[PDB]
Ligand binder design. Structure first.
Ligand code: GDP
Ligand code: GDP
Lengths: 218, 342, 370, 369
């Protein structure tokens, strides 16, 4: 009965679907304005390097499900996702002279491949399974568990919890190449770095726990 | 027994006492049938009372509208209490202006009632009905006159169950705040007509560069009011024409008024304490420019430079207060993206 | 607070009658100026029923209409006549002022191109500022030897008329062909009356604000120089639907650049809750450019259509692109100056209008102040 | 961020109208431009509903259709007539460009086979003049004709931001093979399907590819190599689709290698099997890429119109497109020595020679320098 009157009209399930939707279209126009700050400027933009803490308002009937320490994890993946959209869009909005373009495809590929991995293979695989699971909710408690077994696993596949200075930092430092090369628009000294860090990336990730091979091809 | 159904009972009884076919015997037998049930089931006690409430309310709604021209009284309320007939109150201010700026005394109570009565006849609005029901009061001996002005309404008998002196009290508070902003915009518009009249000093432009600035802070503050009055009123007028129950009216109307205290930024102290300073600060400005016929030379320009040092800060101060419903106010204030520079 | 209306010139006397037959039709007023049986505040334009009009060959055409009981071509020639009937007409004007309770403004309908208008309309604006100094003088002037009559008049409208609305016949004749398919004067005037009628909608019906002519103009004109406006009439359905058609220059009667302030008038029964939703998407799309120097906003107002007679719409625009129309005229003026008692008044008039076009071109800069 | 369409000549007006037919058929918009009761963000391709269409003899035919509520033969001939109405048409563009909140692109449907090729040549040089921050994509259609064709190439080689070839001969082949017709009114039925399915990710929002610049720039390695060819086999798992796509029987083009592949999947397929399909494509190695740059294949998921079964579209950047140019090029050298300055025709022949000579070098292990 509760779920029935919650599709229209304390629909906890309806609120949950919107949650993972207003981040992870609409949010495309939002970030593009940030590319070209102030704390009130953003709000009117939203209502229309690593910060932007986002929160939301949840009614008591669903407060027990979407806890307070649950907001931060949902915020954690949102921060990292934007940096990927940033590098992906920064190298995309523009259009030994032509030699720079060979450094573009050699790079615009790599960030693009990673983005195809986090969103599709992870942020849409477990998402498709999670919805098929919540529709069979039969308990107050287990609905927390099926939910808590969705964040603590999506925070592991997306490598953000541990092995950060061992693996995650590598993707982080090469992301700085997406910033440096974007502004300039020394060239030889980039591929010496790029061919090194990229090989550093594969020769480190080569230890593969098993799901990392879906990107290890490149 | 829940307190809700207790509110239903008292209404049906008072509505017949004040009132002094087939709807009588049927209610008797139902009351008697309940006494034979060896179990008092609360789900059934309400099942018969809710029909009786909706029965006397339906017939009363007929007498309150069709023969006697609840909706009609509500329209009168929205007019005079909520400044619905705003044109009447600008001519009322034009006449009852000098007899209110001085501190109020025991005679100004009646000195203004003849002005208000003269105001309704001044806009050819003539009705011996509903005119003597509005008697302006002055809270005297327990300060400018506007700080004690009030408007009372003598409710009829059938509507006394819905209009207690308490609900007519919260209405009175709104009438004071809405009349205040309507007063400052009027005298401010007169200043606009004073600069335009003075078409042919280098410092003479500093007035309108601040006047037109201080005009948008009040005019837009005076907007969002038709977008909160003519909108909430559109819902309350809908809630009655949909439900046949009387309890719905007593809660929807009580809910309708509660929004006016919140949406109109009255209960929230900070927004109520910030724009409050814009009111009396503007009084000094419009008075200063009207208190002279030439340029502000003898320390007048030395006085204008004092308010701008306070007002311009308050402009950015409210900009920080904004950054639930303030978007409906900030959208109009920043559609031109000027406050982004402050 | 009543508004006495004056009508001069053939064009002015013609549009007024079509403005009058339109207004009395919206109310329950018979052509015999008597109420018919069939809330609407009717005091602003009518005296207790007679309209507060002063009409100044064409008069015969008006008295022959069933509305009878309702009451040369050179700039120098028109003015000379004015000073000769100076005393005669003012007693007509003065008696109407004392008759009103609290006179507020002066609506005037005249054409700069019209000789009588270029001679008699110009003379009144100087006398009106002399006799009554505390009364606004707003005119519904309409742009069309022809350039001479135009520029000489603009010299007065920039210092006497504290407000003004321009109606260009070129764009009007254009709109007649594309969306009306007429090809005369008798057809284009139909749309002219629609503008003036909806322009004074908020005054004739009791509302919350906008209960005086000052209530509309003061938000538009910030400075005594920037005193030119423009109109736009869309219907020739939600609140967001009507606004997107306003800002299109395809309907505005006109032939960087940015506005100053916008006033929107809605005559329908639309739900007033979603109007704040419409403005948000407009700011998101950024369909109109604004001034960065001073605080400005976009406004909207609601009213009720005449029941005795569906959503309409009228917009009041203060655009700097209107300066171009002046340049075109003054350009032709300089063209006739080099091809053809003192010939000096026409010289200073060219200089003072140079300040106006300068003020607008300097208004679209981040440093318009000083 | 919206995209405005422009239909030029009999061809462009024909292909656009049918495309606007099916697009209005897919969306829940009745032919009378009135919403039907019966999830889709349509502000990019519709204005509140009137399409942002700029049409340019066939005008009578469009009006005669019940969709009236929805709004010589020389190349130098078209070029002259375009300057004559320079401000005549650009006011319609400007009233809509400035009438659009934030314009994003410029799609063009035109045939370079008579006057639309000349007028189209006029728009490109003109659009680059005024709008420097606006994308220009052209859905040009290919087959005295060699002349008009080669000039439009010279203009399209440096003006347009992208290009999608649509040759009639290859389209003529599909007309008989899988349809058994032998008609102009029938071949375009596929062209509209090619157009509509191309922008499905933009009309139905998803996670990736929320802007047209997001799709194209993944393919184009350098602004010189901005020529694309498409694929549409469905006329079944994710692996069945892509393998059906690489067969040259389906490609709409009449050593060599690819540059990059972008795929569109519109069915109800599962995102669990797509990453494995790419592997079997690599292991079995049904296609080769450039030897210099590490090339990738991309594929996107979408949602079919509910108001309307697994279908798919393929976009390709294949260096075999050079052969198509060389044919008309040979045809030009044929009529040049066979029959007031006649000098611009040589300038066009020089630049198109550059692009071809870059194709042949683009597929070599030493594309650098
Ligand atoms: N909009 C409009 N303009 C008019 C009308 N009648 C005349 N005009 C304008 O008046 C100008 C001609 O002036 P004219 O009537 O000869 O002046 P008069 O000889 O002093 O009356 C033309 O340029 C017209 O644009 C009318 O009915 N409507
Ligand atoms: N595939 C295809 N080609 C077309 C169609 N309509 C016209 N064409 C081509 O367009 C060319 C003629 O273009 P034309 O009518 O002269 O363009 P215009 O000079 O601008 O009017 C021919 O070579 C046709 O092959 C169509 O519906 N489908």
């Amino acid at each position: 009965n509760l779920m029935q009157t919650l599709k229209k009209d304390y629909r906890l399930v309806e609120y949950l679907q919107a949650m993972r939707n207003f981040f992870l279209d609409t949010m495309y126009d939002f970030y593009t304005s940030i590319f070209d700050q102030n704390v009130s400027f953003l709000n009117v933009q939203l209502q229309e390097l690593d910060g932007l803490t986002l929160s939301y308002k949840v009614p008591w009937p669903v407060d027990i499900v979407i806890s307070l320490e649950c907001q931060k994890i949902y915020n954690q993946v949102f921060l990292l996702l934007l940096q990927i959209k940033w590098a992906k869009y920064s190298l995309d909005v523009l259009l030994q002279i032509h030699r720079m373009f060979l450094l573009r495809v050699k790079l615009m590929h790599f960030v693009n491949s990673l983005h195809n991995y986090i969103m599709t293979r992870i942020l849409h695989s477990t998402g498709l399974e999670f919805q098929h699971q919540v529709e069979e909710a039969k308990d107050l408690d287990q609905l927390i568990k099926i939910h808590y077994r969705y964040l603590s696993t999506i925070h592991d596949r997306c490598l953000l919890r541990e092995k950060v200075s061992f693996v995650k930092e590598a993707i982080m430092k090469v992301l700085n190449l997406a910033l440096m090369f974007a502004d300039g628009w020394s060239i030889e000294k980039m591929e010496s770095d790029f061919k090194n860090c990229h090989m550093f990336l594969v020769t480190i990730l080569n230890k593969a726990f098993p799901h990392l091979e879906s990107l290890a091809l490149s | 027994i829940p307190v809700r159904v207790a509110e239903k009972i008292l209404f049906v009884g008072e509505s017949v006492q004040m009132f002094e076919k087939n709807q009588e015997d049927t209610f008797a037998a139902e009351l008697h049938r309940l006494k034979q049930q060896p179990l008092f089931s609360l789900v059934d006690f309400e099942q018969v009372v809710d029909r009786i409430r909706s029965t006397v309310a339906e017939h009363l709604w007929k007498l309150m509208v069709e023969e006697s021209d609840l909706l009609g009284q509500l329209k009168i309320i929205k007019d005079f209490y909520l400044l619905g007939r705003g044109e009447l109150f600008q001519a009322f201010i034009d006449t009852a202006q000098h007899m209110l700026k001085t501190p109020p005394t025991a005679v100004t109570e009646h000195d203004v009632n003849v002005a208000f009565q003269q105001s309704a006849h001044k806009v050819l609005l003539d009705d011996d009905n509903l005119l003597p029901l509005l008697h302006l009061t002055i809270e005297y001996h327990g300060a400018s006159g506007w700080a004690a002005l009030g408007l009372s309404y003598k409710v009829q008998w059938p509507l006394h169950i819905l209009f207690t002196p308490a609900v007519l009290e919260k209405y009175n508070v709104v009438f004071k705040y809405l009349l205040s902003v309507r007063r400052v915009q009027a005298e401010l518009q007169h200043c606009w007509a004073l600069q335009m009249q003075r078409k042919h000093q280098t410092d003479a432009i500093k007035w309108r560069l601040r006047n037109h600035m201080a005009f948008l802070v009040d005019n837009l503050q005076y907007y969002l009011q038709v977008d909160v009055l003519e909108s909430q009123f559109s819902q309350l007028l809908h809630q009655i024409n949909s439900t046949r129950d009387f309890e719905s009216i007593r809660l929807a109307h009580d809910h309708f008024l509660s929004n006016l205290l919140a949406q109109s930024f009255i209960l929230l102290k900070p927004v109520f304490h910030c724009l409050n300073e814009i009111l009396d600060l503007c009084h000094s400005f419009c008075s200063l420019v009207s208190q002279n016929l030439g340029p502000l030379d003898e320390r007048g320009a030395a006085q204008l430079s004092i308010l701008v040092k306070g007002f311009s800060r308050q402009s950015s101060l409210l900009f920080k207060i904004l950054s639930n419903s303030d978007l409906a106010q900030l959208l109009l204030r920043l559609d031109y993206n000027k406050y982004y520079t402050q | 607070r009543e508004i006495i209306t004056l009508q001069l010139g053939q064009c002015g006397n013609q549009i007024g009658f079509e403005f009058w037959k339109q207004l009395c039709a919206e109310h329950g007023i018979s052509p015999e100026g008597i109420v018919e049986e069939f809330t609407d505040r009717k005091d602003v334009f009518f005296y207790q029923y007679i309209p507060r009009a002063v009409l100044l060959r064409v008069i015969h055409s008006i008295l022959n209409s069933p509305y009878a009981k309702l009451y040369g071509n050179n700039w120098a020639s028109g003015f000379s006549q004015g000073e000769k009937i100076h005393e005669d007409i003012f007693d007509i004007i003065d008696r109407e002022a004392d008759g009103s309770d609290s006179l507020e403004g002066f609506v005037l309908c005249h054409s700069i191109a019209g000789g009588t208008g270029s001679g008699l309309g110009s003379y009144l604006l100087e006398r009106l500022n002399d006799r009554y100094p505390k009364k606004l003088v707003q005119t519904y002037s309409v742009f069309p030897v022809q350039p001479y009559n135009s520029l000489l008049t603009l010299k007065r409208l920039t210092q006497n008329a504290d407000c003004l609305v321009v109606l260009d016949n070129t764009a009007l004749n254009r709109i007649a062909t594309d969306r009306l398919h007429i090809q005369s004067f008798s057809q284009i005037n139909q749309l002219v009356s629609t503008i003036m009628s909806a322009s004074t909608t908020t005054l004739r019906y009791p509302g919350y604000m906008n209960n005086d002519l000052i209530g509309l103009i003061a938000s538009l004109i910030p400075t005594p120089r920037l005193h030119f406006l423009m109109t736009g009439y869309t219907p020739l359905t939600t609140v967001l639907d009507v606004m997107r058609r306003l800002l299109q220059p395809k309907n505005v009667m006109v032939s960087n650049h940015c506005y100053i302030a916008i006033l929107n008038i809605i005559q329908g029964e639309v739900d007033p809750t979603q109007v704040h939703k419409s403005l948000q998407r407009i700011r998101e799309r950024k369909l109109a450019n604004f001034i960065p120097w001073g605080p400005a906003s976009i406004q909207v107002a609601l009213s009720r259509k005449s029941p005795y007679l569906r959503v309409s719409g009228l917009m009041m625009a203060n655009h700097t692109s209107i300066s171009s129309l002046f340049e075109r005229t003054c350009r032709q003026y300089d063209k006739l100056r080099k091809r053809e008692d003192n010939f000096d008044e026409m010289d200073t008039s060219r200089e003072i209008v140079q300040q106006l076009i300068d003020e607008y071109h300097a208004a679209t800069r981040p440093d318009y102040i000083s």
